[PDB]
Design a protein around this ligand. Structure first.
Ligand code: FMN
Ligand code: FMN
Ligand code: CL
Lengths: 168, 168
């Protein structure tokens, strides 16, 4: 039995949460998981914003068409990249960090969903505004987290036709 | 005890391998792990090239910087994205897929490393011409896989200065 592989295969996007907040110890483990990502030339260009402010969460919800569930959580994490530290890899490093965070969540009985910010200038504008992100800090995503309100089922995405040998 | 977190925190880039091939069933599980990634609009734009041809591995080892370990493995997995399927987010989706693949490797006692291809045009061209990739298919990386030659140490990347509360 491989519990890591099981978490990987059972992870799903969770968009509905119980009312209760997530414990600070669990939030910190989510962050620590993200920071364990690999990183081009080990620059470590990620920055994590833990957002619990009701007004900010609601304002972002009301400006992000595919992130309306921000109104229905008490906490979200915004993964950002520092474009001075890694102008050609922050979006790769931070995507790997994001995936660690989502797996960490699944592993601790939490629900989470990756909602895009970058590369959409309208989404970037509101997130940068509400969180006072400096010009060299680019928000990749908003990740609401919470205890799942119901049983959710993973997608089975295996497709042998997306496997190739020695060339296309 | 959280085995998934344990794997996340103990993953490291492994660049030195036992001179022996990896079981096909393990390679398949790597790819299944990759395919389980989240995907913008569920467009699943990933394509995986399993590379066992010696000349292909050696040619990429020669042409790519920081890719010398390709000479020392029997097999590598090249993660690619279909830009017609996901023109704005393929490389984000494919980075999440890549991180699943790396974690899967670590969980099965294998060693792996992300070697950079995207976003460097000269690197992209090497991989494209070696693997006969159609123009709408972009190579993200090359991931050599093997049994680790030696015990390797993970990095502790935790830094509280990269954690922010309610904004920058
Ligand atoms: C986007 C990206 C590009 C990378 N490029 C290379 C590469 O070309 N060659 C290599 O040996 N390692 C490469 N790495 C691995 C990093 O050097 C490594 O993740 C970093 O040193 C942190 O070490 P760790 O993976 O052991 O935690 C890359 C990693 C990422 C995420
Ligand atoms: C780059 C990226 C952007 C995404 N953007 C959003 C988004 O804006 N809103 C949302 O509800 N889900 C978003 N998703 C979640 C996807 O819809 C989801 O991963 C996909 O439907 C597959 O489902 P699964 O995560 O349950 O396997 C995003 C995922 C990725 C990887
Ligand atoms: Cl075999």
């Amino acid at each position: 039995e491989n519990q890591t592989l099981e978490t990987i295969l059972n992870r799903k996007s969770v968009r509905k949460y119980k009312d209760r907040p997530v414990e600070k110890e669990k939030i910190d483990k989510l962050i620590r998981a993200g920071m364990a990502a690999p990183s081009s030339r080990d620059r470590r260009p990620w920055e994590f914003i833990i957002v619990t402010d009701r007004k900010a969460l609601d304002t972002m919800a009301e400006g992000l068409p595919f992130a309306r569930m921000l109104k229905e959580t008490r906490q979200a994490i915004v993964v950002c990249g520092d474009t001075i530290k890694s102008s050609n890899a922050w979006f790769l490093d931070c995507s790997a960090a994001s995936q660690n965070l989502l797996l960490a969540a699944e592993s601790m009985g939490l629900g989470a969903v990756w909602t895009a910010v970058y590369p959409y200038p309208d989404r970037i504008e509101i997130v940068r505004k509400e969180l006072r992100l400096p010009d060299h800090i680019m928000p990749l995503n908003v990740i609401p987290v919470g205890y799942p309100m119901q049983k959710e089922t993973p997608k089975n995405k295996y497709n042998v036709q997306q496997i190739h040998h020695n060339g296309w």
